[PDB]
Amino acid sequence: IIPVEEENPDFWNREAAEALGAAKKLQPAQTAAKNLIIFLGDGMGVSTVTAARILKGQKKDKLGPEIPLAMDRFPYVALSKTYNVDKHVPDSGATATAYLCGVKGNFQTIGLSAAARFNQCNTTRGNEVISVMNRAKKAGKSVGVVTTTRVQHASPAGTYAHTVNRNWYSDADVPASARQEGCQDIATQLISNMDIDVILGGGRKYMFRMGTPDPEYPDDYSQGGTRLDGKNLVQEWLAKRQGARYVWNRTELMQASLDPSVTHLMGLFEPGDMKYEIHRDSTLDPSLMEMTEAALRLLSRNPRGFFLFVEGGRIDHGHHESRAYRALTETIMFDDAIERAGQLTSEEDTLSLVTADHSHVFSFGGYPLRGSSIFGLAPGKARDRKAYTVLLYGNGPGYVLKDGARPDVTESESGSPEYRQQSAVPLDEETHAGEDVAVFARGPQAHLVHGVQEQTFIAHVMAFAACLEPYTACDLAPP
Amino acid sequence: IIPVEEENPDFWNREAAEALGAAKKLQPAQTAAKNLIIFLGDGMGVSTVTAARILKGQKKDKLGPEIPLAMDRFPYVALSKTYNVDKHVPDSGATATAYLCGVKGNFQTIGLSAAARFNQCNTTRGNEVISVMNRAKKAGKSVGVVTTTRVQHASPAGTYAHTVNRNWYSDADVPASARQEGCQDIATQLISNMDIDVILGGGRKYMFRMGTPDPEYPDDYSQGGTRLDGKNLVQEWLAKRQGARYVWNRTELMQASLDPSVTHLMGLFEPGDMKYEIHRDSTLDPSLMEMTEAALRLLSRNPRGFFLFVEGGRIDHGHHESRAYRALTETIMFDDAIERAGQLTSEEDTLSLVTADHSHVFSFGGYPLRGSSIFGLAPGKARDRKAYTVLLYGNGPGYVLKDGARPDVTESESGSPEYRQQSAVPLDEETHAGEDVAVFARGPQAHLVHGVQEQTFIAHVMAFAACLEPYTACDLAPP
Ligand SMILES: *[C@@H]1O[C@H](CO)[C@@H](O)[C@H](O)[C@H]1NC(C)=O
Ligand SMILES: *[C@@H]1O[C@H](CO)[C@@H](O)[C@H](O)[C@H]1NC(C)=O
Ligand SMILES: *[C@@H]1O[C@H](CO)[C@@H](O)[C@H](O)[C@H]1NC(C)=O
Ligand SMILES: *[C@@H]1O[C@H](CO)[C@@H](O)[C@H](O)[C@H]1NC(C)=O
Ligand SMILES: [Mg+2]
Ligand SMILES: [Mg+2]
Ligand SMILES: [Sr+2]
Ligand SMILES: [Sr+2]
Ligand SMILES: [Zn+2]
Ligand SMILES: [Zn+2]
Ligand SMILES: [Zn+2]
Ligand SMILES: [Zn+2]
């Protein structure tokens, strides 16, 4: 469709004149950040952002690519180089070390320098690097971790944990030799390394002894407790703090978030990762936006400010499945959470960064018409005389050969929430990609986010803006 | 390989502290741009930039991803939305209208508003939109167009031409009805629409009457003149100007560039597009870097300044072939030209923008080790038990089935300059992609390049910075 208003050059000339006017108005702050928020889109590379924009624009009443996402409205953009020390295409653990601790690490470790080695417990000590969340707490700020994954998963764990193996969710995962050597599982690290005021996401099962029924799935034994050491970590965490509450459903979360006198809140809403938004039970489970608002209600009470980590964690999981429908709907909900947090905080005293840990081998091609569905077929047949999709993957589990041939695909098939887009190379899981990702920033000192930077810059600019960490003696006026 | 220096957190902490220091030093100019340069990487999306960085870093003595490209050193970055009015995944003609004329257009038209229609000559008049190069000339600046494509190809044509069909290179291409209606071929438009001081690239054949032997290939008749109208456009162009020279080889180009008294220079170095850098004859053909320096020698003589368009034009062509080796080597030469132009001009009075018209369905995945070749195999076998490459395409001519199966690939095969990376979907040509591309900027008013913008912003910020176009009464001090 060609929109009539866009046929007149004046439309474009007016828009551009307005954009120049807005660019000229922007001015750097001389003041510090009271609050810090990092919004982490796991796997949300540039192709994901664009495809999500088109989908979100269409879900409103529009053609798609012209309608800004909430993240698109952030004034300052940089590119971030995501390589881990040992691998050009990174994982979530070692990238977390970069954007939360300010130091690059080795693939599949978390919160360690690259002197440590994956799955070698005896290389841990001496190599711990402390997160800016930890530093914010040390400075008297409240701190919160919100995600749609397990709260023990690689991204959130970067805020609090130090481990040579991101797979060590509970003691059941840690080999006996490493347990003997004192390497703590991530669930233990979650309650023990530092005080965290708000913890919201998945991961019930790692907190409870083997045999403990899950409250939501008391008749599915695989969803029960995993721990070998007999410990109830939720009860241990509650015991250590006045005003602490544990919740496992939406209604109780929202109740707790309105109760002054709560002060510490742990909400764990599934045994493992949270459901995809498209599968979410709206009576029992909070959306990402709802978890972020609940967190902000509590964190905002502290006059010294807060650090919050919010993760669109299952964007990544959608791409790994080669189900763009799931990756993109998770992206929209992530952008809705960014929008909500911007309503509940002030850019006068809150530095907000949106970024991704790494990208995916996800592409958006063919030559589709303006207004067409992102989940549709490319115009024209391929050289094998069958249809193909505008969305494709380099590799992953969408690769199919039926009767020794690439399958044809229809619009009804391609638009299904279970549809897997085709790839070049069959793998059980599609792979991350190595290309630079975007950083969007707004608020005090956001103008420092510029150019092409190492991913470690994210942690450092946040520490600097809030006068933490090695940047006490920032030269900044108070928020 | 894990580089020893990177195992120490101090390495990363020092780098980040230096990056913060550099970010704090940057300050907006109050002065105008005397000169404007736009460097256009045709097809050079984010995945291309990253993969090129790694290749260029390795060609030096290094591991790859840590070594900045010249473009990476530009202080200001924005994302650019590339959609054409009628198509989400754009072509080079209509994107050119956006980044050179400041107005979006319809797929496969050039220099027209979206009121015009592809291949409908009778929708042209009234819909012409004037480029910022044209406006720079009107203001007394010298202007130049440098590319590795035909100088009549879609990108360079955006600087000077208005046409409903980018395929109308010479009169031989224009249907009789359109010739009768007065639609001029692009080669004619090149010499007739506006005065251009420097024209360097390919496209000899469109300038000369059918039967005219090419000077380099006088024994290949397909490389000869195409024109039906009997015209020699080179001679017409020379006749219209004192101090004009035409050259068709490297030695004569460089001679002409050192001769004051030349003033106007047209250098056309192949019948069609220039050779890929890897095939270039270094005695007969100038590199992109050499063409840009030759242009700058002439353009810099004007005290009022200049506008220069430089295009890494065959980055795109490499991707279309699904031969990443060609796409990436063209990218490196493009970055070398950017580096050279920065040596020959001052960021005190020259606004330089590097961008792309659109991206490609090119991805960089698997989990390769630090320091490994970008053209190598991903570690580990695929689910069909054969090897695969770290570089892949969504679609294009790398798709193969030998004996009804995906072919295995070796390192020696995958590293060859003729190697085509595999894709999901066979097409004769790999497709463009729709995702946002980067804009890098340095110089006067470069701080206005920020955030996520429409691709039209590129033309508008350039016009504004130089006080042209609708922005006479910019509010700026002189350069
Ligand atoms: C870690 O443990 C293994 C024992 O199997 C040993 O080979 C290696 O030397 C140890 N490294 C250190 C730093 O002690
Ligand atoms: C939510 O949890 C509370 C506390 O255990 C429980 O009493 C309530 O029934 C739960 N809601 C649902 C629908 O299960
Ligand atoms: C362009 O030409 C064709 C004649 O084949 C006609 O159908 C169409 O109406 C014309 N459009 C205009 C604007 O004259
Ligand atoms: C370059 O062109 C000039 C001018 O026609 C010609 O005299 C010279 O021989 C050319 N060089 C080569 C190597 O062909
Ligand atoms: Mg994650
Ligand atoms: Mg081009
Ligand atoms: Sr639940
Ligand atoms: Sr030649
Ligand atoms: Zn990730
Ligand atoms: Zn992942
Ligand atoms: Zn192009
Ligand atoms: Zn192209």
From Swiss-Prot, chains A, B:
Residues 403-427 are annotated as: Disordered. Homodimer. It is a lipid-anchor; GPI-anchor. Zn(2+) 2 binds at residues 316, 320, 432. Binds 1 Mg(2+) ion. Binds 2 Zn(2+) ions. The active site is at 92 (phosphoserine intermediate). It is found in: Cell membrane. Belongs to the alkaline phosphatase family. This is Alkaline phosphatase, placental type. Mg(2+) binds at residues 42, 155, 311. Its EC number is 3.1.3.1. Keywords: Calcium, Cell membrane, Disulfide bond, Glycoprotein, GPI-anchor, Hydrolase, Lipoprotein, Magnesium, Membrane, Metal-binding, Signal, Transmembrane, Transmembrane helix, Zinc. The gene is ALPP. Alkaline phosphatase that can hydrolyze various phosphate compounds. InterPro entries: Alkaline_phosphatase, Alkaline_phosphatase_AS, Alkaline_phosphatase_core_sf. Glycans are attached at residues 122, 249. PANTHER family: ALKALINE PHOSPHATASE, ALKALINE PHOSPHATASE, PLACENTAL TYPE. SUPFAM superfamilies: Alkaline phosphatase-like. One of its GO terms (molecular function) is alkaline phosphatase activity. Residues 412-424 have a biased composition (Polar residues). It comes from Homo sapiens.
